Design an enzyme around this catalytic site. Structure first.
Site, mmCIF file in Angstrom:
data_model
loop_
_atom_site.group_PDB
_atom_site.id
_atom_site.type_symbol
_atom_site.label_atom_id
_atom_site.label_comp_id
_atom_site.label_asym_id
_atom_site.label_seq_id
_atom_site.Cartn_x
_atom_site.Cartn_y
_atom_site.Cartn_z
ATOM 1 N N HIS A 1 0.812 -1.211 0.000
ATOM 2 C CA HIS A 1 0.000 0.000 0.000
ATOM 3 C C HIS A 1 0.846 1.261 0.000
ATOM 4 C CE1 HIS A 1 -3.333 -2.663 0.848
ATOM 5 N NE2 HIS A 1 -2.688 -3.131 1.902
ATOM 6 N N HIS B 1 5.909 7.019 6.255
ATOM 7 C CA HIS B 1 5.583 6.583 4.909
ATOM 8 C C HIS B 1 4.993 7.773 4.180
ATOM 9 C CE1 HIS B 1 1.853 6.189 7.187
ATOM 10 N NE2 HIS B 1 1.298 6.623 6.069
ATOM 11 N N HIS C 1 2.116 9.087 0.899
ATOM 12 C CA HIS C 1 1.041 8.857 -0.061
ATOM 13 C C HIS C 1 1.334 9.782 -1.235
ATOM 14 C CE1 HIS C 1 -1.370 6.819 3.054
ATOM 15 N NE2 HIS C 1 -0.716 7.649 3.853
ATOM 16 N N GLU D 1 -3.301 13.450 0.949
ATOM 17 C CA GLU D 1 -4.557 13.018 1.561
ATOM 18 C C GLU D 1 -5.301 14.212 2.143
ATOM 19 O OE1 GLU D 1 -3.401 9.433 3.990
ATOM 20 O OE2 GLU D 1 -4.394 8.556 2.256
ATOM 21 N N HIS E 1 3.752 11.009 6.293
ATOM 22 C CA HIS E 1 3.168 10.717 7.604
ATOM 23 C C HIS E 1 4.229 10.100 8.501
ATOM 24 C CE1 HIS E 1 -1.083 10.466 5.692
ATOM 25 N NE2 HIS E 1 -0.704 11.714 5.924
ATOM 26 N N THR F 1 -5.786 6.644 7.876
ATOM 27 C CA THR F 1 -6.365 6.892 6.560
ATOM 28 C C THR F 1 -6.395 5.647 5.699
ATOM 29 O OG1 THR F 1 -4.269 7.513 5.534
ATOM 30 C CG2 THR F 1 -5.531 9.290 6.625
ATOM 31 N N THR F 2 -5.954 4.507 6.212
ATOM 32 C CA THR F 2 -6.140 3.229 5.540
ATOM 33 C C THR F 2 -6.867 2.308 6.501
ATOM 34 O OG1 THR F 2 -4.072 2.264 6.382
ATOM 35 C CG2 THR F 2 -3.956 3.468 4.309
HETATM 36 N N1 LIG Z 1 -1.891 6.785 6.762
HETATM 37 S S1 LIG Z 1 -1.857 6.816 8.428
HETATM 38 O O1 LIG Z 1 -3.236 7.343 8.997
HETATM 39 O O2 LIG Z 1 -0.606 7.669 8.916
HETATM 40 C C1 LIG Z 1 -1.582 5.144 9.044
HETATM 41 C C2 LIG Z 1 -0.577 4.907 9.970
HETATM 42 C C3 LIG Z 1 -0.393 3.604 10.423
HETATM 43 C C4 LIG Z 1 -1.163 2.559 9.950
HETATM 44 N N2 LIG Z 1 -0.998 1.172 10.369
HETATM 45 C C5 LIG Z 1 0.205 0.614 10.967
HETATM 46 O O3 LIG Z 1 0.203 -0.544 11.240
HETATM 47 N N3 LIG Z 1 1.375 1.433 11.248
HETATM 48 C C6 LIG Z 1 2.564 0.884 11.882
HETATM 49 C C7 LIG Z 1 3.242 -0.186 11.036
HETATM 50 O O4 LIG Z 1 4.028 -0.909 11.555
HETATM 51 C C8 LIG Z 1 -2.149 2.803 9.017
HETATM 52 C C9 LIG Z 1 -2.361 4.095 8.575
HETATM 53 ZN ZN LIG Z 2 -0.434 7.638 5.872
#
Ligand SMILES: NS(=O)(=O)c1ccc(NC(=O)NCCO)cc1
Ligand SMILES: [Zn+2]
Ligand SMILES: NS(=O)(=O)c1ccc(NC(=O)NCCO)cc1
EC number: 4.2.1.1
Length: 257
Positions: free
Chosen positions: A61, A91, A93, A103, A116, A195-196
């Site tokens: 993703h 990470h 997007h 986003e 993020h 957001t996922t």
């Molecule tokens: N795009 S977001 O809202 O910053 C986000 C952050 C962590 C997650 N999930 C997660 O497991 N993060 C830690 C990975 O090891 C999913 C979405």
């Molecule tokens: Zn994110």
């Protein structure tokens, strides 16, 4: 499985994750004139000097640069936050085109990408417990626009060839996330969600006003990644962003006039 395609993208997620239609979903449009300046908001405290990056992972993703979060090595405090939040990963997007990819939006403007930096509240002991709590995470969101290169991003860019496909990981030590920050730490803040999927409503969002600029070549290298695993049909990892969701009963606060 959920994704960003025609048949499994954000408009389908509610069928497996009904919280997708919840009361504090992210991202949102930041209407800058309606955000309220809150002089009681403290400056953010970003303490990344002892950060220990470990690995970079294509999870199908996005790609995550993961950190040692077993000690208070890279922490976020202050701002709207009570207590100490530990950096676990960052990470991005991004879009298929420079005109889209973020986003969050600012007065409906989309940026080319959004970083993020994900942190969890140490009072909950680990990330898995923290995501179950309304104040469990703090995500620092930073917009990317295309222009001059960001020198502190190039080490990330250059390792992406090693993790082209879903499930690939590579050692990624000694990366300093301070090289991804803009000059100013002025921010907007609101309560929201991942957001996922699983879209859990556990995030204090802190979105920086000032974007960073990255080069066209840097973002082009993001777009060479694959959502698929090796030996599966190739689908470029692009447009891995959720669109803005209804603000509902929320007010976005600004740390700056
Ligand atoms: N795009 S977001 O809202 O910053 C986000 C952050 C962590 C997650 N999930 C997660 O497991 N993060 C830690 C990975 O090891 C999913 C979405
Ligand atoms: Zn994110
Ligand atoms: N976005 S979602 O509600 O998690 C979802 C899950 C499965 C699908 N479709 C699916 O699994 N089709 C079978 C082909 O692999 C589409 C969306």
């Amino acid at each position: 499985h959920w994704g960003y395609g025609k048949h499994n993208g954000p408009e389908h997620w509610h069928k497996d994750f009904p919280i997708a239609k919840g009361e504090r979903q992210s991202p949102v449009d930041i209407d800058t004139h309606t955000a309220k300046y809150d002089p009681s908001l403290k400056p953010l405290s970003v303490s990344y000097d002892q950060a220990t990056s470990l690995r970079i992972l294509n999870n199908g993703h996005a790609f995550n640069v993961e950190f040692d979060d077993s000690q208070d090595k890279a922490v976020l405090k202050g701002g709207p936050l009570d207590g100490t939040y530990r950096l676990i990963q960052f990470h991005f997007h991004w879009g298929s085109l420079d005109g889209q990819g973020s986003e969050h939006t600012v007065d409906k403007k989309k940026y080319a990408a959004e970083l993020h930096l994900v942190h969890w509240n140490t009072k909950y002991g680990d990330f898995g417990k923290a995501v179950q709590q309304p104040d469990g995470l703090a995500v620092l969101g930073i917009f990317l626009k295309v222009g001059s290169a960001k020198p502190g991003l190039q080490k990330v860019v250059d390792v992406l060839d090693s993790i082209k496909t879903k499930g690939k990981s590579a050692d990624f030590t000694n990366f300093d996330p301070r090289g991804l920050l803009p000059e100013s730490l002025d921010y907007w803040t609101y309560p929201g969600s991942l957001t996922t999927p699983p879209l859990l409503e556990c995030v204090t969002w802190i979105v920086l006003k000032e974007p960073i600029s990255v080069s066209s070549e840097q973002v082009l290298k993001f777009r060479k990644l694959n959502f698929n695993g090796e030996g599966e049909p190739e689908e470029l990892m692009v447009d891995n962003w959720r669109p803005a969701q209804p603000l509902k009963n929320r007010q976005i606060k600004a740390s700056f006039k």
